[PDB]
Amino acid sequence: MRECISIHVGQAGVQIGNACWELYCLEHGIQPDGQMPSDKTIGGGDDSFNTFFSETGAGKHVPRAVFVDLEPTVIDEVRTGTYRQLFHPEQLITGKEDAANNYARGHYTIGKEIIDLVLDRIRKLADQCTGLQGFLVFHSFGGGTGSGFTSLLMERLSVDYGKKSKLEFSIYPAPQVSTAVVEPYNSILTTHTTLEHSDCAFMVDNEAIYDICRRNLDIERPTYTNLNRLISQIVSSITASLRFDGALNVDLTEFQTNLVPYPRIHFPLATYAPVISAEKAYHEQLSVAEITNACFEPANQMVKCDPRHGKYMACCLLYRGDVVPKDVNAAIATIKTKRSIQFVDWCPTGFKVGINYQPPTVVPGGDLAKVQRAVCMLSNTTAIAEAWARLDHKFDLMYAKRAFVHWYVGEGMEEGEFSEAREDMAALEKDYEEVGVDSV
Amino acid sequence: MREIVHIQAGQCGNQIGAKFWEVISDEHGIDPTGSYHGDSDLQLERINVYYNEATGNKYVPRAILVDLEPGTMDSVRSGPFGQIFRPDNFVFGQSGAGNNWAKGHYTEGAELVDSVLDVVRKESESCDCLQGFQLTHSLGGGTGSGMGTLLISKIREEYPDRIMNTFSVMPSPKVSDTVVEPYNATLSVHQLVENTDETYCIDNEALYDICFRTLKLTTPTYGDLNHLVSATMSGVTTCLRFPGQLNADLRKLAVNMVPFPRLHFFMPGFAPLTSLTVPELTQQMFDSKNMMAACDPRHGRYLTVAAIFRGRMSMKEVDEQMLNVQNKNSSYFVEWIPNNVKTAVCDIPPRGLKMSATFIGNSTAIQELFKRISEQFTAMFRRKAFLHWYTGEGMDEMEFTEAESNMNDLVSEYQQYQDA
Ligand SMILES: Nc1nc2c(ncn2[C@@H]2O[C@H](COP(=O)(O)OP(=O)(O)OP(=O)(O)O)[C@@H](O)[C@H]2O)c(=O)[nH]1
Ligand SMILES: Nc1nc2c(ncn2[C@@H]2O[C@H](COP(=O)(O)OP(=O)(O)O)[C@@H](O)[C@H]2O)c(=O)[nH]1
Ligand SMILES: N[C@@H](Cc1ccc(O)cc1)C(=O)O
Numbered sequence: 008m009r010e011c012i013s014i015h016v017g018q019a020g021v022q023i024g025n026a027c028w029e030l031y032c033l034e035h036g037i038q039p040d041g042q043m044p045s046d047k048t049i050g051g052g053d054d055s056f057n058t059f060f061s062e063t064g065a066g067k068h069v070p071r072a073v074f075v076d077l078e079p080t081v082i083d084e085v086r087t088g089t090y091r092q093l094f095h096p097e098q099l100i101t102g103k104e105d106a107a108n109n110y111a112r113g114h115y116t117i118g119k120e121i122i123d124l125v126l127d128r129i130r131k132l133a134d135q136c137t138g139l140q141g142f143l144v145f146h147s148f149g150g151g152t153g154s155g156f157t158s159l160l161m162e163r164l165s166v167d168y169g170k171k172s173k174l175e176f177s178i179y180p181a182p183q184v185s186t187a188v189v190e191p192y193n194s195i196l197t198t199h200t201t202l203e204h205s206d207c208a209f210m211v212d213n214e215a216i217y218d219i220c221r222r223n224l225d226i227e228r229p230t231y232t233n234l235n236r237l238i239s240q241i242v243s244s245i246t247a248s249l250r251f252d253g254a255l256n257v258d259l260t261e262f263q264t265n266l267v268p269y270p271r272i273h274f275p276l277a278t279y280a281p282v283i284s285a286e287k288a289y290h291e292q293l294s295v296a297e298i299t300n301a302c303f304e305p306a307n308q309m310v311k312c313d314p315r316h317g318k319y320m321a322c323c324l325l326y327r328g329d330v331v332p333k334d335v336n337a338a339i340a341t342i343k344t345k346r347s348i349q350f351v352d353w354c355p356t357g358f359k360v361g362i363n364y365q366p367p368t369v370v371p372g373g374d375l376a377k378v379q380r381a382v383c384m385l386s387n388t389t390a391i392a393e394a395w396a397r398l399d400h401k402f403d404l405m406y407a408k409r410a411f412v413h414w415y416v417g418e419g420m421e422e423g424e425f426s427e428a429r430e431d432m433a434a435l436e437k438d439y440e441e442v443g444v445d446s447v
Numbered sequence: 448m449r450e451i452v453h454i455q456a457g458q459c460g461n462q463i464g465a466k467f468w469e470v471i472s473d474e475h476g477i478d479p480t481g482s483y484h485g486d487s488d489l490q491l492e493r494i495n496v497y498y499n500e501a502t503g504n505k506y507v508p509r510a511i512l513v514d515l516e517p518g519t520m521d522s523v524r525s526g527p528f529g530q531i532f533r534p535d536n537f538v539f540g541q542s543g544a545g546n547n548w549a550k551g552h553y554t555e556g557a558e559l560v561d562s563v564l565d566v567v568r569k570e571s572e573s574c575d576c577l578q579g580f581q582l583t584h585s586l587g588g589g590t591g592s593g594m595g596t597l598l599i600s601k602i603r604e605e606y607p608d609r610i611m612n613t614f615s616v617m618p619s620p621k622v623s624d625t626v627v628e629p630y631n632a633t634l635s636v637h638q639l640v641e642n643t644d645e646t647y648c649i650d651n652e653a654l655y656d657i658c659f660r661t662l663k664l665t666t667p668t669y670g671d672l673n674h675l676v677s678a679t680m681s682g683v684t685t686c687l688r689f690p691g692q693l694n695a696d697l698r699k700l701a702v703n704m705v706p707f708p709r710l711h712f713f714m715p716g717f718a719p720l721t722s723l724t725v726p727e728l729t730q731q732m733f734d735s736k737n738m739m740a741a742c743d744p745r746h747g748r749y750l751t752v753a754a755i756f757r758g759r760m761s762m763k764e765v766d767e768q769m770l771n772v773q774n775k776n777s778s779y780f781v782e783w784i785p786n787n788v789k790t791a792v793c794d795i796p797p798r799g800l801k802m803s804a805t806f807i808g809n810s811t812a813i814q815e816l817f818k819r820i821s822e823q824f825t826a827m828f829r830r831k832a833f834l835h836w837y838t839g840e841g842m843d844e845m846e847f848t849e850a851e852s853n854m855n856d857l858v859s860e861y862q863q864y865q866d867a
């Protein structure tokens with residue numbers, strides 16, 4: 008039942024959305040025209056996949072999703088592409104002029120012209136739900152729309168849906184693929200503004216994904232297409248418990264109980280395995296032990312940081328495919344007797360396990376080998392704060408000279424907003440230090 | 448003292464309750480369609496304690512199934528004996544309780560509870576002489592724990608002169624779903640101290656250890672745990688369900704087992720548990736490895752004990768062996784309650800066994816269980832960890848402080864009689 012509405016904001020949010028929804032269709036046997044032969048209840052139902060897809064009387068399975076961007080060219084590709092029939096046109100929303108890598112334009116100058124229309128479209132999706140659970144919001148930190156429009160939208164969703172859950176998948180900037188010098192300003196501004204409005208946020212460091220593609224898939228120079236296919240496998244792992252049933256399946260909301268010890272401490276670290284090429288996977292079966300071991304290898308993390316140099320407040324293992332508890336328990340025991348896994352003194356140390364039996368899927372033409380079993384670890388580690396420290400320092404370097412600040416002030420913002428946001432980030436860093444200190 | 452009304456709440460509560468009904472249905476010769484096909488008159492003599500009769504000699508469990516989400520009860524309804532329950536007695540919401548006592552007790556549960564009481568009232572109304580209620584639930588989740596204890600309070604308000612009995616599954620970090628279990632269990636235990644007459648304390652750690660250490664199950668499932676619980680619940684209710692002299696109703700049991708109103712938390716045990724003579728049965732039933740609260744009986748004293756033997760066996764030998772246990776370990780039975788062990792025997796053995804025994808002990812050692820929960824509670828509460836899940840439902844920290852104090856008081860009251 009419990010429906011989830013996905014909102015894909017700006018270029019990164021939209022292109023990652025493309026990859027996710029394509030992958031979901033393949034996992035569920037939904038064709039590009041939205042038909043699903045295996046679904047025998049026409050025009051509706053309460054199957055697990057219905058959390059993410061509504062149905063029309065003509066048998067179309069329609070994503071519960073809105074795609075929004077302030078310029079039209081990325082969403083235009085969706086409108087004209089392979090899955091164009093999947094979406095009702097009103098779910099794909101564009102303006103004419105983008106935010107120009109400026110949070111201020113995304114939140115105020117341009118964003119304000121389209122925010123009411125976007126809310127109207129989201130309301131139309133919500134009115135079709137019988138038990139809406141919440142929202143999943145996909146966006147970059149660095150873009151003007153991804154940063155500024157997302158913030159505005161999150162603020163408005165708090166007002167219109169109260170404390171209905173809002174989760175983010177947030178794309179953290181990397182120099183190898185970034186397109187604006189001001190991305191650190193945009194990141195801090197949006198992180199500050201969204202913090203009280205988000206229940207849980209999964210950061211995806213483009214640099215971490217870039218190096219996984221280069222190192223584990225032998226891709227010379229990863230493109231967004233390469234990055235997004237990997238990201239979608241990870242998002243799929245996280246949402247699989249919402250979209251599939253199963254005796255050993257554990258709901259994402261139940262993992263969230265363990266992952267969020269205080270409202271602001273809501274940024275889990277995801278680590279995914281196995282990421283391997285067809286050439287390397289051939290004749291090589293990677294066992295539960297092997298993929299579990301890989302979750303404690305920092306090179307497989309979706310955010311660059313070193314958990315061996317922090318403390319854990321939760322560890323969750325989300326398995327999919329050919330996996331049974333006996334083998335998981337054995338792998339965990341081995342890891343316990345060999346790894347730098349130290350918990351804070353106020354949290355239990357047991358790992359929380361879920362298993363979804365539906366095996367992983369890959370998109371044709373992709374880089375990942377098709378495997379029989381995979382795992383996503385979600386941990387709450389103080390180490391994730393290193394990501395904020397890196398961004399915060401870049402912010403400080405430029406802000407000390409007020410470099411580029413006139414672009415924001417010109418669009419109506421005040422320096423006071425910059426210092427407020429940065430102070431909130433300094434407080435968040437301190438929060439992460441404090442939770443790690445032993446109890447008196 | 449005839450009818451008992453059974454309530455099962457939340458995931459654990461419904462999963463164990465379903466198994467309980469399958470097991471005693473089999474024992475009473477009732478098939479999944481509610482038809483009787485037994486060969487002994489003992490089967491029907493007291494069948495009305497747990498079952499109503501319907502047209503066509505049909506028997507229907509006096510059972511109410513409660514949950515804040517549909518999943519587990521959908522599974523029950525699809526289960527083996529699922530069609531035996533009264534369809535109108537499935538009472539459920541859609542939103543779930545998120546493993547959150549506050550959601551079960553104050554918000555989500557509050558919205559559903561009147562409709563549960565309506566069904567309870569309908570069942571109670573067709574009782575010639577209602578003894579009281581039995582509730583199955585866990586203390587570590589949201590619905591069984593929070594809503595289950597809310598129900599108990601409202602039932603007591605409406606039926607204050609009836610007995611309230613619970614089978615209450617206590618959480619353990621070794622067999623755990625979430626980190627907030629100790630908060631949910633602490634909040635619940637205070638409700639149970641006040642509003643139940645008899646609570647069977649079933650520790651998931653004990654169940655796990657029996658499955659793994661004793662039964663040699665390498666990887667126990669909740670299903671394996673529930674098989675043990677099933678068997679135990681059948682054993683402890685034998686005296687209510689069949690002709691007999693001792694502990695034949697919930698009040699007489701309470702009067703025999705509860706010398707001080709708050710100390711009504713029992714350790715149950717079962718024998719045999721194997722990977723059988725009367726002596727062996729008797730030794731195994733008093734064996735700590737056969738008990739289900741993860742407390743060492745030698746770390747305390749027995750205030751009262753009920754033993755129930757099942758199968759065809761020499762009552763002479765039963766009496767002899769029970770005397771031998773008390774006379775040879777007399778220090779573990781408080782001397783200021785003379786003759787505090789009572790024994791019953793029922794000729795009808797459980798399925799698959801020629802003889803069995805069930806143990807119900809009121810032991811001061813049970814304080815160890817409350818101590819473990821108290822420690823786990825404090826480890827988190829000292830840092831106010833995970834409390835936003837509860838404050839978001841309107842609770843304040845002071846309610847946690849009070850529950851913790853209440854449970855520490857319970858622990859202190861046991862210890863007092865341990866040194867008495
Ligand atoms: N992983 C991934 N990152 C992307 C993708 N597209 C853009 N990015 C990253 O997103 C940031 C740039 O923000 P965008 O999403 O392109 O910008 P926008 O939201 O459309 O905002 P404006 O164009 O300023 O209105 C940079 O850090 C890019 O590397 C993508 O498809 N995948
Ligand atoms: N023995 C046993 N324990 C269970 C079962 N299901 C859940 N639990 C335990 O019950 C507690 C969680 O509560 P649960 O009943 O699932 O939550 P609820 O639906 O909100 O009442 C934890 O301590 C679990 O270990 C079960 O089928 N058997
Ligand atoms: N020492 C504080 C740490 C803390 C961190 C972040 C917070 O938002 C709140 C508190 C505590 O555990 O209570």
Ligand SMILES: [Ca+2]
Pocket residue numbers: 046047048049050051052053062
């Ligand atoms: Ca359907």
Ligand SMILES: [Ca+2]
Pocket residue numbers: 542555558
């Ligand atoms: Ca409600």
Ligand SMILES: [Mg+2]
Pocket residue numbers: 017018078105150152
């Ligand atoms: Mg753009």
Ligand SMILES: [Mg+2]
Pocket residue numbers: 458459588624
């Ligand atoms: Mg549960």
